[PDB]
Assembly symmetry: C4
């Protein structure tokens, strides 16, 4: 489960990194950052400047938001919860 959401999240971010670095001309790290803050809805960066960028982003949001939060709802619910929960036991 977690490992699978891990991989799926990775592929989604890799695709975003390749897309924005190519079409929006971003450095890879900036392309990855944009992909991450977009899918997590933080959206603290300027929007895409090209129409291709805008269209892809719209589809990217709809298809990737569900996956990213599903993964997050496990990274802390099935991995970080116990580590802290079990330790909260004297």
């Amino acid at each position: 489960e977690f490992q699978v959401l891990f991989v799926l999240t990775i592929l989604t971010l890799i695709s975003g990194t390749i897309f924005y670095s190519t079409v929006e001309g971003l450095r890879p790290i900036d392309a990855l950052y944009f992909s991450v803050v977009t899918l997590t809805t933080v959206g603290d960066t300027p929007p895409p400047q090209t129409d291709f960028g805008k269209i892809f982003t719209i589809l990217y949001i709809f298809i990737g938001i569900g996956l990213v939060f599903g993964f997050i709802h496990k990274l802390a619910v099935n991995v970080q919860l116990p580590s802290i929960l079990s330790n909260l036991v004297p």
Copy 2:
């Protein structure tokens, strides 16, 4: 269900596209983009400049956020989940 959330999401975005292109003077694609990042809460674009735009946006957020995420909670929960889940079966 999915098909219905599909259509409802479409109508909501169409209304947003017409509204922002007319009142905020955005090109249709930019009006659609603003509508999408607003309802998904990414909000990476500058806010509306007119009071009419601000008022509509406030109402648009409250009435459309629930629908958009409901749709998303199906596009990946009842459509993208199986496609990957079932295939995860040797």
Copy 3:
């Protein structure tokens, strides 16, 4: 329930409108807009410029986000859902 979440959401937004118009010097409509996009996490506007504004916003987010989404999870789950659901019945 809905009517109560309605009122609670209203009071929260009224407080935000008064606060930002006074401390950040925003016109009331802009103060209301900032309050709304902040609590719904759209956050498409520039952040507060004063330290008082930043501190209040931090507390405002933590105390109001839960309420605002609870209300939203009813405005469409217990009000907009039936209207469309029941009508989907031939």
Copy 4:
């Protein structure tokens, strides 16, 4: 539960405050603000300017978003709900 989510949220924000004030050169209050709007997804501030800042932020989002909302889903669900609910009783 609440008290524990309280503390965990605190530590996460303290780490963010120290990180951004040091690496991005922000005043402590601004570092705390950035940490808060990032983890709650409001993201109304300019993104980090350094690559170290971008990388940390990516990891910070994935590890802290779940915790922050879990806490929020208690600050109003197990603390602010009764206070208003019980009082709604004549």
